[PDB]
């Protein structure tokens, strides 16, 4: 009960972190678990409609916070709903340029390193590397 | 059933001062490189 | 980094159309503007009331001091000096000050005919390090261009450790952009214009 | 580090003050060198400056107490050791709290004596 | 007859071509569309980069184009823009901080910066008074490098605002950016000092809201529209056409932008 | 006060024995040898710690462009096991040891002690006092 | 450090087990200095072998000199933190 | 010669110290 109450207050902005750190998507993963979104949504159902709407809106905003400011400025120009696709296309285009620049085997090693640092799933990295290769030809 | 955890507590990020290889290029640029290191640490503490 | 990143990171070489005659030139004009704003402005013209090259003056000094070599007598440093010694010291001091200002950094004679104070030794040491460091750096920056190694300096970092060490990606993510951008540029100027 | 250095300096000055007390009570105050005289004056100010009015004693002693923060304490004593407050009268440090109290009590003393002069000059 | 001035500052040719097609198809040829690098009125600037001749960089949340996520939010983000010199020359933001370290005199640059900040502060307080807010939020990057430009910015902005009678709260770049993206309803008017990090924050806010057109106030006196994406540029053109005195055309462009952001030209 | 050679060296040794953290073998033995051979006779007692700090951490010979040794520099921490094998009074390490000590002593007396003897400003006096404290606590 | 480990072993052999190192023992030390790049240590070993052993292998001496020159060309002859000049009120005493 | 050519809490203490000593000089005068 306390965890959900603290999370709701934090998202609402009533209570900030100990060091007043920004309330980013990463910050919650670091305190309220990876499943801060699913458990919070289930908990919110036990609250009036107004609180439910606020929780949904705050969760959506936090998800948008998962990107850097520069990425948001570059890719979120035409709305947030289209941000993910634009970012993915931009990310894919960079992969194509790298492949055409320094071969494929090095790119495969680079993708492995980036996925390792990105905490991406082995499936997502394989899906990404296959897509860029297909885009090349 | 005692206290479990302070969810509003975050371990502050640990700034690490960038170290440059000791070459003549570093000696000539010692002040400039040091300024970059200080800026990086400041950008780490504050966040951006 | 306590979270799966929204997107990957790639080497930010998108703006790869960066020329080497353009990058140096841009640095060149930044310097000239500063040199002028720091020094001030070109001082009012001064007219030589005489006319002789520094080589001619040096030859005349050598001829003048050569005829008195037999008369010239050495003595202990603490002992009083002679007319010939004083004339030689003054002439050589002026000549070597002029040469050092011009650019003929012959330290062997400068340390002899110009060093009379500890401040002189200190400023000479600074000048001797600066001169001999710039020379060495040139060979490093020229050879670097025979392997094609990137001109810009590169810090000793292991980003896989940095990614893992930090909490939120944005700060460290930004760090990669700055250093990569720094490494993809040549921090050199056109010293012909600067000297001019 | 600043706190440790100041504390050691105060201890050293107090120890020297005790040694100088023995000499002045033997050879005479005038026999002290210029440095010794300055040390004596600074030490006496320190001894007077170590006394503080407690808030608990307000009812009995009347004078309002003072709570001196550590930051003020280090700066107040550090300045005195250097010699910045070499013109303030010695008694201004007796039973006062903080450097600011030393200054305000000096105003109240300088202004108080101003009336005395106008009186003694006149009458 | 009439003229619309298109400025390009770091914008891809695709966006510029889309803007030209939109105006030509909507206007119908009555108003010509000329391209330049500087203007004071009837001007649309495409691209993240700041054009030459703009001193204020205000942006708001238009009611019509509010994204469902940010419905009801009302905050004005004004970025102070110092005079822009040629790309090769050292910018006033850079010069004002490095010349002091180098020891070079910095009198004229300080005077120019002071004038720019005063104009930006006057715009910010005017917006705050119009909206009715009592306190504004200054944003200054806390990097040690920018220890002089920000100091002058705070010294002048607070002076002007306090003279006007409103309160000022100084904050950094990361905290305000997170607050503006997550909880923007707690900020009424936020001024931003001239940095390359504040510019990104302004762009991020203008995009996250759903895509809007930024207003630039120039030295000559006036307002010019600014966009960076298809939707933002389309809204900027719609506002510009409205200023020229075209209501139906402006509404059609706005409706097209709302429906089909990336392909407004074909949508309308 | 008659100050003979034994008295001077004895006083310097007592000053050197003041330590806070354990000293690496090379640093300790080198400093003792220098004091034993009279290189610290001209150095004031209160400045011994600052002299030792410069000898160990810094290097004035490299600083003021007057370096002639090939291997015996105090930044080469691997010499500890050569000093422990051949003894400082060896034909292999004795010659270079004297040269660097002489250069270090000469530079210190020329540059540092001379300035320290010309400090009268109260602010400077505090600055020098706190420098000595930091050196006493660090080698 | 390999050099430190080997030197300590020789000290045990010489000063505690009372066994004199042979030429082969010093050759390994010289080889490590060349391989590691510690040219300043190599100078001392070279003199050590000449003083005690029947000279030093020529190849190792030449290789050691080669390492020194490359550092001299590259400006790595000495640690650079030492070259930076500082005075009385500049030293940080760290 | 060249040196001559070229050229808030603590302020309160300096202000008070200066002003405190200002009256100490004035009383001596008259």
Cβ–Cβ under 8 Å, residues E103 and E134: no
Domain closes at, from A47, A67, A87? A67
Cβ–Cβ under 8 Å, residues C169 and C5: yes
Measure the CA dihedral E36/E38/E40/E43, to 10°.
Answer: 40
Neighbour subunits, E (≥3 Cβ pairs < 8 A): A, B, C
Query: Distance (Å, rounded) from C-alpha A12 to C-alpha A4?
Result: 12
Q: Which of B9, B20, B25, B34 to mutate to test the interface with C (most CBs of C within 10 A)?
A: B25
Q: Where are the alpha helices (DSSP H) in D25-87?
A: 34-49, 58-61, 70-82
Q: Give residue for tokens 């001559």.
A: H4
**Cβ contact C37–E89 (<8 Å):** no
Residue F64, H or E segment: none
Q: Which residues of B touch E172 (CB under 8 A)?
A: 46-47
Q: Are residues A118 and A130 in the same domain?
A: yes
**Cβ contact B14–C165 (<8 Å):** yes
Question: How many Å from the N-terminal Cα to the C-terminal Cα in chain C?
Answer: 53
Residue C69, number of CB atoms within 10 A of its CB: 8
Residue D67, number of CB atoms within 10 A of its CB: 10
**H14 CB burial (10 A radius; 0-12, 13-18, 19+):** exposed
Domain closes at, from A39, A67, A95? A67
Q: Are residues A45 and A100 in the same domain?
A: no
**Cβ contact E69–A74 (<8 Å):** no
Q: Which two tokens stand for residue E13?
A: 């040719």
- Closest of E190, E188, E189 to residue E198, by C-alpha: E190
Strand partners, E169: E137
Query: Distance (Å, rounded) from C-alpha D102 to C-alpha D80?
Result: 11
Q: Which residues of E touch A22 (CB under 8 A)?
A: 174-175, 177-179, 182
User: What is the DSSP-derived secondary structure letter of residue B12?
Assistant: P
Query: Distance (Å, rounded) from C-alpha E43 to C-alpha E224?
Result: 5
Cβ–Cβ under 8 Å, residues G93 and F135: yes
Alpha-carbon distance C11 to nearest alpha carbon in chain A (angstroms): 8
Breaks in chain G after (C-N > 2.5 angstroms): none
Q: Are residues A76 and A127 in the same domain?
A: yes
Q: Are residues A75 and A53 in the same domain?
A: no
Question: Beta strands of F12-113 (E only): which ranges?
Answer: none
Q: Are residues A59 and A73 in the same domain?
A: no
Query: Distance (Å, rounded) from C-alpha E205 to C-alpha E180?
Result: 7
Nearest-by-Cβ selection for H20 from D110, D114, D117: D110
Query: Distance (Å, rounded) from C-alpha F88 to C-alpha F28?
Result: 12
Query: Distance (Å, rounded) from C-alpha E76 to C-alpha E58?
Result: 7
D44-54 burial code (b ≥16 CB/10 A, e <16): ebbebbeebbe
Residues 6+ apart with CB under 8 A from F85: G7, G10, G11, G14, G15
Domain extent for A90: 68-137
Q: Give residue for tokens 């002789």.
A: C52
Residue E80, H or E segment: strand E76-80
Q: Are residues A48 and A91 in the same domain?
A: no
Residues 6+ apart with CB under 8 A from F64: C125, F107, F111, G85
Domain closes at, from A38, A67, A96? A67
Q: G with A: 3 or more CB pairs under 8 Å?
A: no
Question: How many Å from the N-terminal Cα to the C-terminal Cα in chain H?
Answer: 39
**Cβ contact G75–C126 (<8 Å):** no
In angstroms, what is the C-alpha Rg of chain F?
Answer: 15
Secondary structure (H, E, C), C109-170: HHHHHCCCCHHHHHHHHHHHHHHHHHHHHHHHHHHCCCCCCCCCCCCCCCHHHHHHHCCCHH
Q: Which two tokens stand for residue D16?
A: 């020297």
- Closest of D110, D117, D100 to residue H24, by C-alpha: D110
Question: How many Å from the N-terminal Cα to the C-terminal Cα in chain G?
Answer: 25
Q: Where are the alpha helices (DSSP H) in chain A?
A: 2-12, 25-31, 36-44, 49-64, 69-75, 83-102, 105-118, 122-136
Query: Distance (Å, rounded) from C-alpha C156 to C-alpha B17?
Result: 11
A27-36 burial code (b ≥16 CB/10 A, e <16): bbbbbbeeeb
User: What is the DSSP-derived secondary structure letter of residue F112?
Assistant: I
Instruction: State the resolution, in angstroms.
Output: 3.5
Alpha-carbon distance C27 to nearest alpha carbon in chain B (angstroms): 15
Q: Are residues A111 and A137 in the same domain?
A: yes
By C-alpha distance, the chain H residue nearest D92 is: H20
Query: Distance (Å, rounded) from C-alpha A40 to C-alpha E168?
Result: 36
Secondary structure (H, E, C), B31-48: HHHHHHHHHHHHHHHHCC
Q: Are residues A53 and A96 in the same domain?
A: no
Cβ–Cβ under 8 Å, residues E189 and E133: yes
- Closest of A87, A135, D74, E167 to residue C8, by C-alpha: A87
Q: Are residues A75 and A136 in the same domain?
A: yes
Query: Distance (Å, rounded) from C-alpha F126 to C-alpha F112?
Result: 16
Q: Cα angle at G22 between G21 and G23, to 5 degrees? A: 130
**E136 CB burial (10 A radius; 0-12, 13-18, 19+):** buried
Report the Cα G41 to chain-centroid distance in Å.
Answer: 1
- Closest of A77, A1, A75, A60 to residue A25, by C-alpha: A60
Query: Distance (Å, rounded) from C-alpha C179 to C-alpha A102?
Result: 20
Q: Which residues of A touch C170 (CB under 8 A)?
A: 68-69
Q: Are residues A72 and A62 in the same domain?
A: no
Cβ–Cβ under 8 Å, residues E157 and A1: no
Q: Does A77 touch chain E if contact means CB atoms closer than 8 Å?
A: yes
Q: Which two tokens stand for residue E240?
A: 């510009």
Domain count, chain A: 2
Strand partners, E215: E58, E225
Q: Which two tokens stand for residue A76?
A: 């979120």
Q: Cα angle at E224 between E223 and E226, to 5 degrees? A: 135
Q: Are residues A113 and A125 in the same domain?
A: yes
Q: Is F113 annotated as a binding residue?
A: no
Residue F100, number of CB atoms within 10 A of its CB: 22
Q: Cα angle at A82 between A80 and A88, to 5 degrees? A: 115
Query: Distance (Å, rounded) from C-alpha E49 to C-alpha D26?
Result: 83
Q: Which long-range contacts (CB under 8 A, 24 or more apart) does D100-109 make?
A: D100/H12, D100/H13, D100/H16, D101/D66, D102/D49, D102/D76, D103/H13, D103/H16, D103/H17, D103/H20, D104/H16, D106/H20, D106/H24, D107/H16, D107/H19, D107/H20, D107/H23
Q: Which of D2, D3, D5, D85 to mutate to test the interface with F (most CBs of F within 10 A)?
A: D5
By C-alpha distance, the chain G residue nearest F60 is: G82
User: What is the DSSP-derived secondary structure letter of residue B3?
Assistant: -
User: What is the DSSP-derived secondary structure letter of residue C100?
Assistant: H
Q: Is E74 helix (H, G, I), strand (E, B) or coil?
A: coil
Alpha carbon distances (Å) from E132 to C111, E127, E159, E171? 73, 8, 19, 21
Query: Distance (Å, rounded) from C-alpha A40 to C-alpha A59?
Result: 9
Residues 6+ apart with CB under 8 A from F5: F38, F41
Residue D13, number of CB atoms within 10 A of its CB: 18
Report the Cα C120 to chain-centroid distance in Å.
Answer: 19
Report the Cα G66 to chain-centroid distance in Å.
Answer: 14
Q: Which two tokens stand for residue A137?
A: 């030809």
- Closest of F34, F83, F71, F37 to residue F56, by C-alpha: F34
Strand partners, E57: E79, E216
- Closest of E145, E172, E127, E148 to residue E82, by C-alpha: E148
Alpha-carbon distance A125 to nearest alpha carbon in chain B (angstroms): 28
Q: Cα angle at C83 between C80 and C87, to 5 degrees? A: 115
Residues 6+ apart with CB under 8 A from E193: E80, E138, E139, E140, E141, E146, E149, E150, E153
Q: Which two tokens stand for residue E262?
A: 């990336």
* Residue G14: φ, ψ to 5°: -85, -55
Q: Are residues A74 and A63 in the same domain?
A: no
């Amino acid at each position: 009960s306390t965890k959900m109450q603290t999370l709701h207050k934090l998202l609402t902005g009533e209570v900030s972190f100990k060091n007043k750190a920004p309330v980013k998507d990463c910050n919650i993963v670091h305190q309220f678990g990876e499943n801060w979104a699913t458990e919070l949504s289930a908990y919110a159902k036990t609250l009036p409609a107004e609180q439910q709407k606020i929780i949904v809106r705050q969760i959506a905003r936090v998800k948008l916070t998962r990107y850097t400011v520069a990425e948001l400025a570059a890719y979120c120009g035409d709305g947030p709903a289209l941000l993910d696709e634009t970012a993915r296309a931009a990310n894919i285009e960079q992969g194509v340029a790298f492949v055409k620049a320094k071969g494929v085997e090095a790119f495969e090693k680079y993708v492995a390193e980036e996925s390792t640092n990105a905490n991406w799933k082995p499936e997502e990295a394989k899906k990404f590397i296959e897509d860029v290769k297909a885009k090349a030809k | 059933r005692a206290d479990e955890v302070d969810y509003t507590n975050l371990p502050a990020p640990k700034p690490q001062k960038t170290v440059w290889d000791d070459n003549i290029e570093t000696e000539v640029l010692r002040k400039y490189l040091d300024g970059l290191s200080q800026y990086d640490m400041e950008e780490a503490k504050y966040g951006v | 980094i306590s979270g799966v990143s929204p997107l990957l990171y790639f080497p930010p070489t998108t703006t790869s159309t960066t020329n080497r005659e353009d990058q140096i030139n841009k640095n060149t004009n930044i310097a000239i503007q500063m040199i002028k704003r720091y020094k001030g402005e070109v001082p009012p013209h001064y007219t030589r009331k005489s006319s002789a090259t520094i080589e001619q003056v040096e030859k005349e000094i050598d001829a003048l001091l050569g005829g008195a070599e037999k008369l010239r007598k050495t003595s202990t440093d603490d002992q009083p000096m002679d007319k010939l010694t004083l004339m030689e010291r003054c002439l050589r001091h002026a000549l070597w000050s002029y040469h050092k200002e011009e650019g003929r950094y012959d330290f062997d004679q400068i340390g002899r005919w110009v060093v009379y104070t500890p401040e002189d030794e200190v400023k000479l040491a600074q000048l001797k390090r600066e001169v001999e460091a710039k020379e060495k750096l040139a060979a490093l920056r020229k050879r670097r261009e025979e392997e094609g190694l990137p001109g810009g300096p590169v810090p000793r970092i292991n980003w896989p450790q940095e990614y893992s060490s930090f909490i939120d990606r944005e700060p460290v993510v930004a760090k990669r952009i700055r250093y990569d951008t720094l490494a993809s540029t040549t921090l050199e100027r056109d010293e012909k214009q600067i000297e001019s | 580090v600043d706190h440790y250095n100041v504390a050691q300096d105060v201890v050293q000055m107090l120890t020297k003050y005790r040694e100088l007390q023995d000499i002045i009570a033997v050879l005479g105050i005038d026999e002290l060198s210029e440095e010794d005289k300055l040390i004596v004056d600074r030490a006496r100010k320190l001894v007077k400056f170590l006394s503080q009015p407690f808030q608990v004693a307000e009812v009995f002693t009347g004078m309002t107490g003072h709570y001196v923060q550590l930051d003020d304490t280090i700066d107040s004593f550090s300045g005195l050791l250097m010699g910045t407050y070499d013109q303030v009268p010695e008694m201004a440090f007796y039973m006062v709290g903080g450097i600011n109290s030393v200054l305000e009590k000096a105003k109240k003393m300088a202004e108080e004596a101003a009336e005395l002069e106008k009186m003694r000059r006149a009458r | 007859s009439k003229q619309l001035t298109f400025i390009s500052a770091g914008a891809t040719a695709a966006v510029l071509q889309s803007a030209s097609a939109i105006v030509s198809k909507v206007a119908g040829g009555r108003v010509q569309t000329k391209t330049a690098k500087e203007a004071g009125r009837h001007a649309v600037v495409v691209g993240p980069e700041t054009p030459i001749g703009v001193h204020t960089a205000v942006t708001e949340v238009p009611k019509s184009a509010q994204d469902p996520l940010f419905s009801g939010v009302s905050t004005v983000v004004v970025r102070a823009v110092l005079p822009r010199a040629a790309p090769d020359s050292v910018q006033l933001r850079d010069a004002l901080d490095v010349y002091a370290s180098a020891g070079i005199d910095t009198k004229e640059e300080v005077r120019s910066a002071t004038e720019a900040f005063k104009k930006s502060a006057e715009v910010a307080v005017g917006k705050a008074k119009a909206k009715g807010v009592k306190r504004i939020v200054l944003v200054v990057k806390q990097a040690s490098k920018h220890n002089c430009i920000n100091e002058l910015f705070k010294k002048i902005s607070t002076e002007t605002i306090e003279s006007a009678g409103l309160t000022t709260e100084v904050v950094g770049t990361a905290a305000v950016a997170n607050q503006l993206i997550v909880n923007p309803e707690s900020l009424g008017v936020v001024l931003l000092n001239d940095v390359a990090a504040t510019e990104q924050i302004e762009l991020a806010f203008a995009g996250v809201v759903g895509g809007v057109s930024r207003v630039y106030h120039t030295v000559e006196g006036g307002k010019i529209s600014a966009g960076h994406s298809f939707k933002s540029v389309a809204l900027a053109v719609a506002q510009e056409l409205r200023e020229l005195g075209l209501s139906s055309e402006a509404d059609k462009v706005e409706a097209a932008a709302s429906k089909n952001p990336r392909a407004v030209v074909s949508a309308l | 006060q008659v100050q003979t050679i034994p008295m001077i060296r004895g006083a310097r040794f007592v000053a050197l024995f003041n330590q806070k953290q354990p000293s690496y073998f090379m640093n300790a033995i080198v400093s003792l040898y220098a004091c034993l051979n009279g290189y610290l006779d001209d150095v004031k007692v209160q400045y011994v710690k600052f002299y030792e700090y410069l000898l160990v951490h810094r290097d004035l010979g490299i600083m003021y462009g007057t370096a002639k040794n090939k291997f015996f520099y105090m930044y080469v921490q691997e010499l500890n096991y050569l000093i422990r094998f051949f003894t400082l009074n060896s034909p292999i390490l004795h010659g270079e040891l004297e040269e660097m000590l002489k250069q270090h002593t000469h530079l210190f007396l020329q540059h540092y002690q001379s300035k320290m003897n010309a400090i009268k400003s109260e602010k400077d006096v505090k600055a020098l006092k706190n420098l000595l404290y930091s050196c006493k606590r660090a080698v | 450090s390999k050099f430190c480990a080997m030197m300590d072993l020789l000290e045990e052999m010489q000063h505690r087990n009372r066994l004199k190192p042979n030429e082969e023992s010093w050759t390994w030390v010289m080889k490590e200095c060349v391989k590691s790049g510690q040219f300043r240590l190599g100078y001392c070993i070279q003199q050590v072998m000449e003083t005690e052993c029947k000279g030093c292998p020529a190849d190792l001496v030449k290789a050691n000199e080669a390492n020194a020159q490359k550092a001299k060309t590259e400006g790595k002859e000495h640690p650079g933190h030492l070259s930076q000049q500082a005075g009385l009120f500049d030293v940080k005493v760290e | 010669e060249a040196a001559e050519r070229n050229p808030t809490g603590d302020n309160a203490r300096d202000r008070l110290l200066k002003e405190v000593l200002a009256l100490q000089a004035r009383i001596n005068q008259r």
